[PDB]
Amino acid sequence: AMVLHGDMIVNGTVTASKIVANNAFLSQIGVNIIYDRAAALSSNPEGSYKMKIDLQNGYIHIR
Amino acid sequence: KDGSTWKQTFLIDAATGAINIGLLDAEGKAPISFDPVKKIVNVDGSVITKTINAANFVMTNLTGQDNPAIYTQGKTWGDTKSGIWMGMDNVTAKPKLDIGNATQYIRYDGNILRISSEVVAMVLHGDMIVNGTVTASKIVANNAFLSQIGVNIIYDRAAALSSNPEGSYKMKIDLQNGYIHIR
Amino acid sequence: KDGSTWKQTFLIDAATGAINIGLLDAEGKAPISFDPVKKIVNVDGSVITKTINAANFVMTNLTGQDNPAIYTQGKTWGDTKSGIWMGMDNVTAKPKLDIGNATQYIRYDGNILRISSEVV
C-alpha cells in the first residue's frame, strides 16, 4: 500500500517481515548466518549453497 | 400588473387546492408553487442556511434510479474531471466516490478503493507486525535486526552503493559454484 | 396583535408583489418572505429532512466567490481546528478538503493530497 511520487527521508521506523529488491545502497548492515539466494530464493534457504560464513561460532564451512 | 403582461405571483384556487408562489417558468408550476392534490412539497434554493436537524442525505422518489448521494452535479464515478461524488450510489447499490482528478486523486466504490497516490507512502506512528506480505524492489537502511536471510552472491556496498555493484570489491563469496575469489 | 407591538407575520402587497411570511428581522425581509420582483426564492431551515432529489452541492450567485462546497461554517483549508471542508473550492478553481486536526488528519487540494498519518 505504498505508491510513490517522491523521495522519502523516513522520520519514523521502517519495519517489515520480508524483502525483495534489485539492489540496496545501504549504510550499515546485519546478516547473522550467511546463506545465499543461491539457496534462499531457491527452495530451502538451507539448500544448495557452497560456503556458509556464520560469524557466531567460528564457522567457515567451505564446499 | 405590468405592460400587457399580467405577471401573477401568488395564487390559491378553490378548484384543485393549488397553492402558487413566485413567477412561473414551468408549464403549470412555479419554483415554490404547491399542489396538495397529488400531494407534493416543492421548493428550491436557500440564500441563508446555517442549520439543519436531519441529514438531508438520502435521495428518494426512485428507490433505485435516484441514487442516495450528495455530489457535484454533472460528474460522477468514472469522469476525468476533478469534481467530486459522494453518498450511497444505487446503480451499484453501495457508495461510489471520487475526489480529485483521474491521476492524482482518491477513488472508492462501496466494496473497494483505489488511491493511486503517495504520502510523506508509509508514515509511521506505531509498530507493525505485518499480517500480509512485505514485498519491494529496492531497500536502503541503517541496520536490520532480521530473523533469516538470503544473499545469492556476496557483493559489497563497497561496490553496491559504489558505482557498478560488480565494481571495487576484494572477495566475492558466491555460494553457488564453489566460488571463493580473494583479492 | 400584541401590546403596542403590531407584530405582523403574513403579507401580500399589490404594489410590489411582495409575499412575506414569518416575523421580520431583516430591514425589509423575513426568513421565508419573498420578492418575485427582482425575483428571489429565499428560505432557510428544515426541521425534518429525509429526502432530496438533486445533489444540492454547488454554490452559485457568485461564479468565483461563492465556492461550490459543503463544509463546516467557520473553517476551511488551512485552519488548525479539527473541523471539515469539502466540495469544489473556486478560489483555487478545484476541490479543497480537510478532515481532522492539523497533525493527525487528511488534507487534500484539487491537484494533490497530504495525509501525514499511518495505518496498520
Residue numbers in the entry:
A (entry chain i): 626 to 688
B (entry chain h): 345 to 464, 626 to 688
C (entry chain j): 345 to 464
Authors' text:
FhuA, an outer membrane E. coli iron-ferrichrome transporter, is the bacterial receptor recognized by T5 (25). We present the structures of T5 tail tip, determined by cryo–electron microscopy before and after interaction with its E. coli receptor, FhuA, reconstituted into nanodisc. These structures bring out the important conformational changes undergone by T5 tail tip upon infection, which include bending of T5 central fiber on the side of the tail tip, tail anchoring to the membrane, tail tube opening, and formation of a transmembrane channel.
After two TTPpb6 trimeric rings, the tube continues with a p140 trimer and then a DTPpb9 hexamer. A BHPpb3 trimer closes the tube and forms the beginning of the central fiber that continues with a pb4 trimer. The p140 trimeric ring is surrounded by a p132 dodecamer that forms the collar, onto which are grafted three LTFpb1. The proximal region of the central fiber is made of three strings of five consecutive FNIIIs, two at BHPpb3 C terminus and three at pb4 N terminus. After a hinge region, the three pb4 monomers merge to form a 110-Å-long β helix spike, formed of a 24 β strand longitudinal mixed β sheet prism. The central fiber ends with RBPpb5, but this part of the map is poorly resolved and did not allow building an atomic model of this protein. This 310-Å-long central fiber bears two hinges, one between pb4 last FNIII and the spike and the other at the spike-RBPpb5 interface: It introduces some controlled flexibility to this otherwise rigid assembly and may ease RBPpb5 exploring space and encountering its bacterial receptor. Three TMPpb2C copies are coiled in a superhelix, burying hydrophobic residues in its center, interacting closely with BHPpb3 plug. BHPpb3 closed conformation would be stabilized in a metastable state by the assembly process and interaction with its tip partners, TMPpb2C in particular.
